[PDB]
């Protein structure tokens, strides 16, 4: 798994954290948890997208761009 | 490595709230029923925050003998 040699310096992880060594604080917790906030965040960055102009061409009176290297009928 | 509760109660009770936090706080609110039936009314009344009397949901007879009124007798129709 590893390359020959000596361990990669730092290759082992150090050991699992409890829960009571967790550096964060019980109100944030409960807050992300019951909120949503996560989710929330991914929803405004749906509402960012509906005020961004859209990629769409309107087919087939305007075409995409080709090459003139396009291969097409022979 | 989960706390126990009867030994170390105050240590489980942090955990539940961090790791079980719907478990934990539909406990809390449950016990916050009793809490202000306990503190409010008791509360209110040292403000002044008086109950409302029930309102009347039958007729209201009065209590007593009948007073003996005298008018709006046959004799004065038309
Ligand atoms: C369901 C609806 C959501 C209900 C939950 C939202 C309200 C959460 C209130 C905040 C929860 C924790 C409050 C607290 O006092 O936390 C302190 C204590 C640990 O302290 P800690 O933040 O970890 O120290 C810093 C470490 N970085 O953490 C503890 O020891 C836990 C203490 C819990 C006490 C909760 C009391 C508030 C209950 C609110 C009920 C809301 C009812 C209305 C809905
Ligand atoms: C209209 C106005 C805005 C409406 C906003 C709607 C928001 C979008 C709703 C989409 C549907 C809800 C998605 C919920 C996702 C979900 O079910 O997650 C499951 C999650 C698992 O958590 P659990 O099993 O308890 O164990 C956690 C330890 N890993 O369990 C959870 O995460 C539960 C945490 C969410 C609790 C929300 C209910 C409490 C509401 C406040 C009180
Ligand atoms: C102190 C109060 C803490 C409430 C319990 C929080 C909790 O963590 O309960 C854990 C338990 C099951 O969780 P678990 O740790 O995975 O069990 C493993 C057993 N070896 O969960 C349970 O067994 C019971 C969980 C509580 C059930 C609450 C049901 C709704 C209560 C509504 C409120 C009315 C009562 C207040």
Redesign the interface.
């Known amino acids: 798994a590893t390359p020959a040699g000596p361990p990669p310096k730092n290759f082992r992880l150090p050991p699992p954290k ?3 060594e ?1 550096s964060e604080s ?1 109100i944030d ?2 807050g992300k ?2 909120l949503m906030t996560e989710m929330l965040r991914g929803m405004y960055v749906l509402l960012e997208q509906f005020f961004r102009p859209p990629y769409t061409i309107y087919y087939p009176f305007e075409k995409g761009p080709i090459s003139p290297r396009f291969r097409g009928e022979h | ?2 706390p126990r509760f009867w030994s170390t109660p105050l ?1 489980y009770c ?2 539940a ?3 079980r ?2 478990l934990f ?1 539909s406990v809390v609110i449950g016990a916050l029923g009793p809490v202000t039936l306990a503190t409010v009314p008791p509360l209110r009344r040292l403000i002044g925050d008086v109950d409302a009397a029930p309102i009347p949901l039958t007729y209201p007879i009065p209590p007593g003998p009948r007073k003996q009124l005298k008018g709006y007798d046959d004799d004065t129709e038309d």
Request: net charge positive; proline share 5%.
């Open positions: 409890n829960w009571d967790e019980t917790k409960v948890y019951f | 490595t989960t240590k942090r955990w709230a961090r790791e936090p719907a706080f």
